[PDB]
Every structure is written in C-alpha cells, then in structure tokens.
Amino acid sequence: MRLPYSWLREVVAVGASGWDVTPGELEQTLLRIGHEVEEVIPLGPVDGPVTVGRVADIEELTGYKKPIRACAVDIGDRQYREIICGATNFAVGDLVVVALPGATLPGGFTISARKAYGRNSDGMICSAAELNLGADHSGILVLPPGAAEPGADGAGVLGLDDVVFHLAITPDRGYCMSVRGLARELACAYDLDFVDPASNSRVPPLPIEGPAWPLTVQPETGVRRFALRPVIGIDPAAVSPWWLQRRLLLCGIRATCPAVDVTNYVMLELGHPMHAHDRNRISGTLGVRFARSGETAVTLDGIERKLDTADVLIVDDAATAAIGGVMGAASTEVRADSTDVLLEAAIWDPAAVSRTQRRLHLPSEAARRYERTVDPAISVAALDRCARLLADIAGGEVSPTLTDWRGDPPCDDWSPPPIRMGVDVPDRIAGVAYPQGTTARRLAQIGAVVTHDGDTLTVTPPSWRPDLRQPADLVEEVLRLEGLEVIPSVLPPAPAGRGLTAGQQRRRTIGRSLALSGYVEILPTPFLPAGVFDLWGLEADDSRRMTTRVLNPLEADRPQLATTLLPALLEALVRNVSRGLVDVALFAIAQVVQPTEQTRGVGLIPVDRRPTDDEIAMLDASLPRQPQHVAAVLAGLREPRGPWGPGRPVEAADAFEAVRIIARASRVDVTLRPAQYLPWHPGRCAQVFVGESSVGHAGQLHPAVIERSGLPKGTCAVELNLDAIPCSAPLPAPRVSPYPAVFQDVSLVVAADIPAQAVADAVRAGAGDLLEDIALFDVFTGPQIGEHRKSLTFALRFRAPDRTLTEDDASAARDAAVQSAAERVGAVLRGWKLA
Amino acid sequence: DVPDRIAGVAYPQGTTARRLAQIGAVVTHDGDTLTVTPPSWRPDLRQPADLVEEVLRLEGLEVIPSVLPPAPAGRGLTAGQQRR
C-alpha cells in the first residue's frame, strides 16, 4: 500500500494541529509499531523552468516509424514554444507540464534545445514518471482543466515536495489499508487526539427516505451489509479535480472518470471499497446469490470468468452486475455516457473473497481489503461521503433514497464480543513493569471500550479490529505501542536436559567417519530424476517404483519422491564429473519416502482440544514410511596419483569398505553375502546383514546401468537403511594376555564358490579361544590344484591366557581348525609353516 | 531454619534445637537465631555448617529429596576442548 505523507499528515492534523515529522522519523515510528516500510519515495526534485503549459497547436510530422507531433505550447506571459513530443494522449487545449531549456529533471537529465525529427524543440512535454510523480505509463501527464494557468510553477502545482510511503501491511491489520487506519496508528504512536475521518462530524449523514433499489440477499453468502444510494444527472464529461487525480496517482491508481475516481478515492481514505453502477443499465431487482455450476460472468475488463459455486455474485434480471467483493461486471459498468449512478457499499465474507479472487487471479484493491475484513460500521458513512463527493465534482444531485441491508435480522451493533483480561497480563508477557494505567490507556487509544473491575479488565474492541479476540491479541497491542526495544534480554533457566539421543550421535559419527575416509557429503534432492528406474532396468513390480508423488512439482517430469538415495547421489556425481572432477566419493544421510498404500488423508481433527492417542496413531499410520538411509557413490581414482605410484581406481571392495566404515561407526558387526540386485553388478554385489536382518546393498554398479545413465565406468555404490541397524551400546572388557604368542600360516584348498569368510569362520570355530587373530594373506589359483578350486593362506596368531603356549599346543589347535574347515566347507590342507 | 535450607527438607519444629541438645550443646533461642555452645568433647563444632551436619546426619540423609537444579545457559565446550 502506497500513500503520500501530505494526505496522511492532513488526516492526523485535524485532531493535532501542527503535527509534522520528517520522512526518516516517520519511517522509524512505523517500523517500531509493526508496519513494514518497503520504500520511502520523495517526489523527485525538479529545478529550473518546469512549468504548466497549454497545448495550442498540434502538427503531425510524417515519414518516421512512430507518429510524432510538433506542438505550439503556451508557457505563460503570452510566450509560445515549439516542442516535439511522441505521446498521443493529449489534444489542443490541454494543460501539460513542460521542462524547458535550463531545467533539470530527476536523474540528472538536463534539458537543452536540441533539434529532433527535423524541427527545433525548446524542451519536452513530461510524463508523470519523468517528473518522478507517479507510475511510468504510456503518454505524458495531462492536468485537468482549470488546474493551473500556463506558466505556473510545476513543482508547486504538482506538489513535488511530498513523500510517498510504500508499506507492506500484514493480513491481521486490514484496517491499516487506508489513510483512516494509518493515521489512527500514528495518533496512537505519538499520543495524539484523533478525529476519525469516517465519523459523523466529518461525514454528516444524508437523508434516508425510501429504498434506493429493490434488493434480495441470500444470507448464506456471508454478506454482512449491503447499502445503495443514487446520484442522478451527473455530467459525463466532467473530470476529477487535480487534487483528487493527484492523490489517486500517488497511491498507484490512474484516474479515469469521477464516478470511478471517487470510489477509489474513498476506498483509500476510509478502507471501505466502493463501486459505481450505471443505474440505467440495471434491469430489475438486484440479487446477491452464489453462482451455479458452469455459470459465467464478464468482468468490466471484458474478460470472461468461469465461476465456482462458492463465488458470490450480484445479479439483476438480465446479467451479472459483480463478482461480489472482487470485481464489477461489464454489464452495469459506468461508461462515457453514464448520467445516473447507483453507488454500492457492501461488506463481503473475507474467506469467500479470499478463495474467489485467488481462483480467478484477481487480487484487486477491493478484494485485498475484503480478504482482511472491512469495518462494517462505516458502510453508509463511506456511501454518503462518496455520493456527496461525486455530486460536487460531476454536478449531479444526491437522491435521498437509501437501501441498507444489515442482515437477517438487522444488525445494529458491530463490535466484537468483550474480552476479559488481568490488568497486569501485558507486564508479565513482556517481562516489563509498565507504568500504571498503561495497558488500559493503550487499549483505549486503539479504540476499545475498557472497564475496570478490581484487577480484571473488560475490553470491547472496535468494529474495525476483528483481529482482537483473545487476551494475547491485546498484549500485542500494548507491547507494540510501548515499543519492543524496552523488553530486556533475560536468559531463562532451561532444565537439565539429556543431550543428544543415541541415534543423533550415531548419525554424527557416521558422517565424521565417512568424511575422514575421503567422502564428501551432499544434500540430496528428494525429487527423483525422470525415468531413473527405467534407466536402472528395474522390474515393473520393484518396490522402489512405488513412489509418493507431488501434485505441483517445479519440474513437471520430476514429481516422484525418492524411495532410494542413490539417484540424487549419482546426479551429484555426474555433475562433478562433467566439471572435470572425475575422482569423487560422495555420501548422503537422509530420509527416503516409501509409501505402503495409496495416498490417504485424515480429516480435520478439531483444534479446540488435543488429538487423542488414537487420532495421533491414525495420523502417523496415514503417512508413508520415512526411514533414514545412508548412501555413497564412488568413481575414478580411490587413491590419487603421486610420487608413491599411479594411484588406484575405485573397485567394488571400496564400497564394501564403506559398509565397514559405517558399521564401525555404528558399533555393529556386519556380514556380506553375494546378491543379485539392480542397479548393482550381479557378480559384484553384496547384501549387507546385521545378525539375520538385511540392512542394504553395496558393490559395483551394473555396466548396463552405467552405460544407459551416462555414469563413469566402474562407478560403485552403497545404500544402507539406518532404521534397520539396531542401536548398540557395548561395554567391553577385553582379555589382554601378556604371554607370548605363536604364529603359524595355513593354506587351505576349497571350491572356488566358497566364500573366504566361510573358511575363516570354520577355522575360527575349530581353533577355539587359543586363536587370537586370523587374517587372509593370499588367494591363489592355478592348474595344479584344480580348475574350479582356490588356495587360501591364513595367518594365525595363537596365545594362551595363563601360560606360554608350546608350539605343539599351537599345532593341536591348528589341527582342530583344519578339521573344522574340512567338515564345514570341504577344505583340504595344502600346507602350514611357522611365520 | 538453616539446616532446613541446606537439606532442602522442612523438618518438624524443634528439630535442630533438639538434635543439638542431644549431642550435648547448650542451646538458647532468641527470636529466630539460635546460640549454640558445643560440649568440650566436640572441638569440631566451630561454624554453622558444622551444626547443619549434626542435624542432617541424625535425621538421616535418606529423607533429603532428589531435586534437579536449574543450571544456567552455559556456553558449552571451548574451542581448545573441541579441537582436542
């Protein structure tokens, strides 16, 4: 909302004459009581000969791209100057504003008598924007007849010493979308007496003698008030005086004709939107009703609107007269020939206006005020104010008839219910001991009726403050007018908290451990890439395809939420690689979204109580499962090149080691088992287990997936479900025998299909507790042991808890380990030695 | 009432004066202030804290409830501590 300081000042000055403040101080006062000042715009300075002129001749220059005019302009004292101008929105006889040689316009533009378009031009005719007066629109500024004489000083006529304040009003303060509301706020901030410009001393009531027009209202439309009053015999050729056109311009409204200008003007002054109908274009009774399915209306911009059954209309016998509270209709619109006007002062349902205008994308000046609730007590004051102004400007007569529907039954008292509050509640909420009388004084200032009864205040807010419903609402009024800056800064005592949960600590430890091992964390987008699971070649019934879908994604082809973190990680990997960073290891820790059913919403639970435990469980059960995952991808060199050697390319074993890094960080033991699971390579894919629970997969990606997706060759990947890895808090008590150890190596031949870990497990089971350590040294294949067999050499370390092991006790334990391997995996002993 | 405050326990009336007599002290009342003269075999009873201990241990420490204090808004670990 835009308004000029002069207007605001004039309204404040009625009750406090002489009041006047600098723009900087006004800005600061508005910020501290809660109004955001987006911009302070002093009307840009002019200097030198910028004066009113009168166009006395127009010659059309031909031959150029555009139409161009050479104008004789009267600039005062019977002096005429030739001026070239490209605008077309003016005629001979019009008052305009000329910047003549020697003048300077805002932005440092000096005017000189240049030669333009073949003729000499002694200056220019100015637009409102070139004067920094108002919005840049097509054509130059034309002042209304009689506004000033040729030669009058531009700065003074235009009022260029004004300042326009551009505010962003919050939706709880609809009453501030007008000079009435902001001036009242200023009166509160500065402790002034305030004269309400909507009051009866300032808007004396007009006569009330018979209905102004037949009206039916279906009350379930939520209309609260609907008043009409006619003005007859206005001159359709009259234009608004300059003072009115100017204020409209500074508030961002272009003047068009008095009947419309006056409704816009009174809207800005008092905050009650107003509309002017051509009464001779109304056919029969005016009806307020909901639209029907499929119904259409043409608004006064000539655009056809598809209506909704929740849209409230004004109709007559023949057509729609308005989309109520949003925009008037073409059929009753004031036109160039309109002589008899019916003025509409209505109060619509805020939510109804809010839904309708957003559906139609019509955030009009009226709609935005009705959305935030317009004061229903001033409809006839605004109607009367607006009829007088129109009759005076356009030379009509105000008819003494008035329709004023005030509900079924009529409502004669508009203020909200009384609110009841302890006198010191604001002091407690603020942590400030305000002087006595403070909250009652501030609550009267904003217009409430306040009565005292011991220590409890009863507060009845005014009708323009529908936001004041509870004690907290009143606290805010007291605190913001006192100023939040007086509230001290006092650290509370927070309780003895328990710190981070075990899960929270684990997710920190996993991140630290992966980062130290060379992985770089990314923040993964939950919006899956288009067609990713077809690139992966997943089966139609793969659970990962069962995705929750977003209705309004920013990219139409990416509406599916991620069931797996790998797509986001591979997308970051491709990005790094395409920028020349080809040796990369990335990880992410984030939830996924895994629905178990079709989207099911749970109906509104009443908010005047807490939901029950069963309602909470039902809300939870309606959501997709959202477990925490950890995942990582690797490509390129795992070990970089340097003086030590050529480096080492990423291999599947690096993904297995990432599993082990995460398991150590989680303090759990994992086992890895061969698996076939896209998008992994079937021969280089491990499924990961904690106990007998599957927690995810790791290994090298499938070469066909790599190739279809444009991934680096040999890319490896890991994804684990953190929710499936049990919590663990071990309390170790390691036995540390100091007696000497015995070292032996053993080589065992097994079928090639036997996993090395199964052999190690068997060796461990047979050797017993004397076996302190076992490590796989060598995997050897060759023709002399059989084409489908392999030799595994294990280093064994034996140690007794209470004595020096004999080398023969060690060999007894080795014999038992060999036998166990023989019985469990069919191992055959090839040889052993002392290490 | 100093023992009551230190213990966080509201002992019955007459409790500290009764216990301090039991251990052999001469106890006189003057409004809310006790004057306590310990016996010659108790050279350890020199300050009010010494008398608090006598009252609290004969009543039994097990009657003292467990009440978490409000500790202030601390600043956490120093930069050096985090670095190490």
Question: What single string gives the DSSP state of each residue in A375-444?
Answer: -GGGHHHHHHHHHHHHHHHHT-EE-S--EEE-TTTT----PPPPEEEETTHHHHHHT--PPTTHHHHHHH
Amino acid at the residue A92: V
Q: For A8, what's the count of Cα atoms within 13 Å in the CB-facing half-sphere? A: 29
3-state secondary structure labels for all residues of A70-113: EEEEECCCCCEEEEEECCCCCCCCCEEEEECCCCEECCCEECCC
B67 in contact with A, Cβ within 8 Å: no
- Domain spanning A741-834, CATH architecture: 2-Layer Sandwich (3.30)
- Please report the DSSP string for A112-174 in residue order: ---EETTEE-SSEEPPTTTTTSS---SS--EEPTTS--TT-BHHHHHTTT-EEEEEE--TT-G
Q: What is the spatial distance between Cα B59 and Cα A231, in angstroms, rounded to a whole number?
A: 94
**Cα atoms in the Cβ-side hemisphere of radius 13 Å centred on B40:** 0
* Deposited experimental method: X-ray
Topology annotation, domain A419-486: Phenylalanyl-tRNA Synthetase; Chain B, domain 1 (3.30.56)
Other C-beta atoms closer than 10 Å to the C-beta of A22 total: 10
Are residues A305 and A272 in contact, defined by beta-carbon separation less than 8 angstroms? no
Rounded to whole angstroms, how far apart are CA atoms A675 and A685? 6
Q: Is A747 in a helix, a strand, or coil?
A: strand
Going from the C-alpha of B11 to that of each of A60, A739, B19, B67, the distances in angstroms are 108, 61, 11, 17
Buried b (16+ CB within 10 A) or exposed e, A652-664: bebbbbbbebbbe
* DSSP at A540: T
Please give the distance of CA A511 from its chain centroid, rounded to a whole number. 31
Beta carbons within 8 Å of A538's beta carbon, 6+ residues apart: A544, A545, A678, A679
- Which tokens in the block code for residue B8? 């966080």
State whether B73 and A496 contact (CB < 8 Å): no
Diameter of chain B measured on Cα atoms: 59
Q: Which residue has the tokens 């444009």?
A: A710
Count Cβ atoms below 10 Å from residue A32 Cβ, excluding itself. 15
Burial of B5 (0-12, 13-18, 19+ CB in 10 A): exposed
Cβ A405 vs Cβ A226: under 8 Å: yes
* Residue A300, SS3 per DSSP: coil
Angle, helices A258-270 vs A379-394, to 10°: value is 140
Structure tokens that stand for B50 in this block: 């010494």
Report how far residue A480's alpha carbon sits from residue A160's, in angstroms, rounded to the nearest whole number: 33
Q: Give the closest residue to A105 by CA, choosing from A154, A53, A144, A150.
A: A154
Asked if B70 and A495 come within 8 Å (Cβ–Cβ), the reply is yes
Dihedral of alpha carbons A805, A811, A812, A815, sign = positive
Report the Cα–Cα distance between both ends of chain A, in Å, rounded: 88
CA end-to-end span of chain B = 47
Q: Does B79 touch chain A (CB under 8 A)?
A: no
How far apart, in whole angstroms, are the C-alpha atoms of residue A711 and residue A530? 16
With a CB cutoff of 8 Å and minimum separation 6, the contacts of B38 are B23, B24, B25, B45
Do residues A742 and A832 lie in contact, with contact meaning Cβ atoms separated by under 8 Å?
no
∠ CA A282-A288-A292, nearest 5°, is 105
Cβ neighbours around A688 below 10 Å, total: 27
**Multiple choice CATH, A215-405, 3.20.20.120, 3.30.230.10, 3.50.40.10, 3.20.20.70:** 3.50.40.10
User: In sequence order, which residues have a C-beta less than 8 Å from that of residue A402 and are 6 or more positions away?
Assistant: A206, A207, A208, A209, A210, A211, A212, A227, A228, A229, A380, A383
**CB-CB under 8 Å, A491 with B73:** yes
Chain A stretch 492-511, residues whose beta carbon is closer than 8 A to a beta carbon of chain B: 492-496
C-beta separation of A334 from A276 below 8 A: yes
Helix (H, G, I), strand (E, B) or coil at A341: strand
Q: Which architecture, in CATH terms, is A508-724?
A: 2-Layer Sandwich (3.30)
Cα–Cα dist A477/A66, whole Å: 58
Query: CB of A491 within 8 Å of any CB in chain B?
Result: yes
Q: What distance in Å separates the CA atoms of residue A570 and residue A543, rounded to the nearest whole number?
A: 20
Query: Which chain A positions have a beta carbon within 8 Å of B73's beta carbon?
Result: 491-494
Distance CA A807, CA A799 (A): 10
Select from A7, A374, A364, A290 the least CA-distant residue to A165: A7
Cβ pair A492:B71 closer than 8 A: no
CA distance B61 to chain A (A): 23
**Cβ neighbours for A266, distance < 8 A, ≥ 6 positions apart:** A272, A274, A382, A385, A386, A389
A474, A444 contact by CB (below 8 A): no
- Whether the Cβ atoms of residue A825 and residue A741 lie closer than 8 Å to each other: no
CATH number of B1-63: 3.30.56.10
CB contact at 8 A, B20 and B27? yes
Q: To which residue do tokens 């241990």 refer? A: B57
Handedness of CA A178, A182, A188, A193 (dihedral sign): negative
CB A15 within 8 A of CB A193: yes
What residue spans define the domains of chain B?
A: 1-63
| Integer Cα distance of A724 and A707 in angstroms | 32
Gap between the Cα atoms of A361 and A323, Å rounded:
13
Among chain B residues, CA nearest to A495: B70
Helices then strands (H, E): number in chain B?
A: 4, 2
> Cα(B81)–Cα(B84) distance, rounded to whole angstroms?
5
Whose CA is closest to A51, among A107, A100, A85, A119?
A100
What H or E segment, with its residue span, contains residue A26?
helix A23-33
Q: Cα distance from B70 to chain A (closest Cα, Å)?
A: 6
* Residue A443 CA: distances (Å) to CA of A418, A465, A468: 13, 12, 11
User: Which residue(s) pair with A356 in the sheet?
Assistant: none
Contact B68 A492 (CB under 8 A): no
Helix (H) or strand (E) holding A290: strand A286-290
Task: Please say whether the beta carbons of B3 and B61 come within 8 A.
Answer: no
What are the structure tokens assigned to A774, written together?
């076992």
Identify which of A573, A712, A688 has the alpha carbon closest to the alpha carbon of residue A633.
Answer: A573
β pairing state of A741-751 and A789-799: antiparallel
Strand-pair partners of A797: A743, A773
A144, A95 contact by CB (below 8 A): yes
Residue A309: phi and psi, rounded to 5, are -70, -5
Measure the CA dihedral A581/A584/A587/A593, to 10°: 60
Run of H or E including A520: strand A520-521
The 10 Å Cβ neighbour count of residue A124 is 22
Q: How many CA atoms lie within 13 A of B41 on its CB side?
A: 2
A490 touches chain B (CB under 8 A): no
CA separation for the pair A376, A407 (Å, rounded): 11
Q: In what order do the strands lie in the sheet with A36-42?
A: A2-4, A163-168, A36-42
> Between the CA of residue A510 and those of A504, A589, A669, A720, A722, what are the distances in Å?
10, 9, 15, 12, 10
Determine the residue of chain B that is closest to A499 in CA distance: B76
Retrieve residue A534's tokens.
Answer: 């077809």
Q: Are strands A340-347 and A225-232 parallel, antiparallel or unpaired?
A: antiparallel
Tokens read off for A643: 């003086």
Long-range Cβ contact pairs of A355-360 (< 8 A, separation 24 or more):
A355/A308, A355/A310, A356/A308, A356/A310, A356/A311, A356/A312, A356/A323, A356/A325, A356/A326, A357/A325, A357/A326, A359/A308, A359/A311, A360/A305, A360/A323, A360/A326
Residue A381 identity (one-letter amino acid) = A
B74: distance to nearest CA of chain A, Å?
Answer: 10
Contact A694, A725 (CB under 8 A): no
Helix axes A502-516, A652-666, angle to 10 degrees: 140
Q: Which fold has domain A50-163?
A: OB fold (Dihydrolipoamide Acetyltransferase, E2P) (2.40.50)
Per DSSP, the residues of A605-631 read: PPTTSPPPHHHHHHHHHTSPB--EEEE
Helix (H, G, I), strand (E, B) or coil at A741: strand
The span from the CA of A594 to the CA of A528, in Å, is 13
Which residues in chain A touch residue B69, judged by CB atoms under 8 angstroms apart?
496
CA A685/CA A676 separation, integer angstroms? 6
Helical H segments across B1-84, by residue range: 2-7, 15-22, 48-59, 79-83
B70 touches chain A (CB under 8 A): yes
**The residue to which tokens 């309109």 are assigned:** A338
Beta-bridge partners for A41:
A164
Residue tagged 């050729």 (tokens): A237
Is residue A261 within 8 Å of residue A244, measured between CB atoms?
yes
In what helix (H) or strand (E) does residue A185 lie, and over which residues does it extend?
helix A179-189
Residues composing chain B: 84
Residue A55 in tokens: 């166009």
Helix, strand, coil content of chain A in percent (nearest 5): 30, 25, 45
B74 touches chain A (CB under 8 A): no
Length of chain A: 835
Which pair of tokens denotes residue A137? 């629109």
Alpha helices in A305-370 (DSSP H): 350-360, 365-370
Helix ranges (H only) for A190-280 are 242-250, 258-270
Q: What number of C-beta contacts closer than 8 Å exist between A and B?
A: 15
Which of B68, B69, B72 has its CB closest to that of A491? B72
Query: What are the binding residues of B for Mg(2+)?
Result: 44, 50, 53-54
DSSP state of A232: E
Asked if B76 is an interface residue toward chain A (Cβ–Cβ < 8 A), one would say: no
* Whole-number Cα distances in Å, A171 to A38, A327, A374, A465, B43: 16, 20, 12, 12, 76
Retrieve residue A217's tokens.
Answer: 């209202």
Q: Give the dihedral sign, CA A507/A509/A510/A512.
A: positive
A496–B69: do the CB atoms touch at under 8 Å? yes
Alpha helices in A667-717 (DSSP H): 703-709
Sequence ranges of the binding site of A for Mg(2+): 467, 473, 476-477
Chain A: residue whose CA lies nearest to B68: A496
Instruction: State how far residue B77 is from chain A, nearest Cα, in angstroms.
Output: 14
Phi, psi angle pair for A361, to nearest 5° = 55, 55
Q: Nearest CA to CA, how far is A492 from chain B (Å)? A: 8
